[PDB]
Amino acid sequence: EELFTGVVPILVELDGDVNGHKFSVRGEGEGDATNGKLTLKFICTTGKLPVPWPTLVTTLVQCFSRYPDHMKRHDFFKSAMPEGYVQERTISFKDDGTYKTRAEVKFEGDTLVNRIELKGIDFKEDGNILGHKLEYNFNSXNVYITADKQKNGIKANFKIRHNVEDGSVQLADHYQQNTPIGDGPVLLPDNHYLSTQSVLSKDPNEKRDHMVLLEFVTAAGITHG
């Protein structure tokens, strides 16, 4: 019965901890899955953020992807709602540290809500992350999604290339698992991918450390006939 017909509003709240630097982020926006489009505004609610906003983009809602008319049959993310789903990820940054995230994504009335715990261990103090040496952009990936028979959900891995201010690239190898919150009702997709493209900006008026994030996601990689 998985119904994202509207433009559904979105809350994101993350609580985080990197090398003992506690912090909290809040995101409000809206998303239209019909058009694979979404818009979001993230504020760090503990003053200054201790890492680059781009490292958090993956972590900070794949229910919003456009799945073309013939591919609805393979949209786990939606199928799993409103009960929702759990998205766990381990993100290792080559020659630097690591993130564990665990996050619960679900409806709460009108709103789609993504609540996340993130803990980052052992990052170099003059590293590219801890030292905010990363360009404020985010390059696009086509993420491959594959059914997990056993845990009754999906998994994914991919390497994000973050651009560094000196002209080099910071690898962030992502590994991800999703598992529904409820029991009984979900769609397990044959492999396919999610092309996802992102634009980071700033609000002219916003005093707090923040990110504006526009984002466009469509699914493809099944074809038929």
Author numbering: 5 to 64, 68 to 232
Task: Reproduce the article's own wording on this structure.
We have used superfolder GFP (sfGFP) as a model system to exemplify and understand mechanism of action of these two different nnPTM routes. SfGFP26 is an intrinsically fluorescent protein derived from the original Aequorea victoria GFP. H148 plays an important role in defining the fluorescence properties of GFP through the contribution of the imidazole side chain to the charge transfer network that modulates chromophore protonation state equilibrium, and maintaining local structural integrity. We have demonstrated the versatility of genetically encoded phenyl azide chemistry to positively switch protein function through two different non-native PTM events: photolysis and bioorthogonal modification.
The structure of the DBCO modified sfGFP148azF (the first such structure of a SPAAC modified protein to our knowledge) reveals an induced conformation change that drives the functional switch potentially opening up SPAAC bioorthogonal conjugation as an approach for modulating proteins rather than simply labelling them. The simple strained alkyne molecule, dibenzocyclooctyne-amine (1, DBCO-amine) was chosen as it is one of the simplest commercially available DBCO compounds and can add new long range bonding capability (e.g. H-bonds via its primary amine and triazole groups) and is membrane permeable (vide infra). The quantum yield and overall brightness at the optimal 490 nm excitation significantly improved on modification (∼3 and ∼6 fold, respectively). The triazole ring lies ∼45° to the plane of the aromatic side chain with the octonyl ring puckered to form a boat conformation. The overall structure of sfGFP148azF+1 is similar to the unmodified protein. Linkage of 1 to azF148 through the triazole results in the phenyl side chain rotating by ∼90° around the χ1 dihedral, with the aromatic group remaining in the same plane. The loop housing 148 also shifts to a position similar to that occupied by original sfGFP, regenerating the solvent channel and interaction network through to the chromophore (vide infra). A putative H-bond between the triazole central N atom and the backbone amide of K166 may play a role in stabilising the conformation of 1 and contribute to the loop shift.
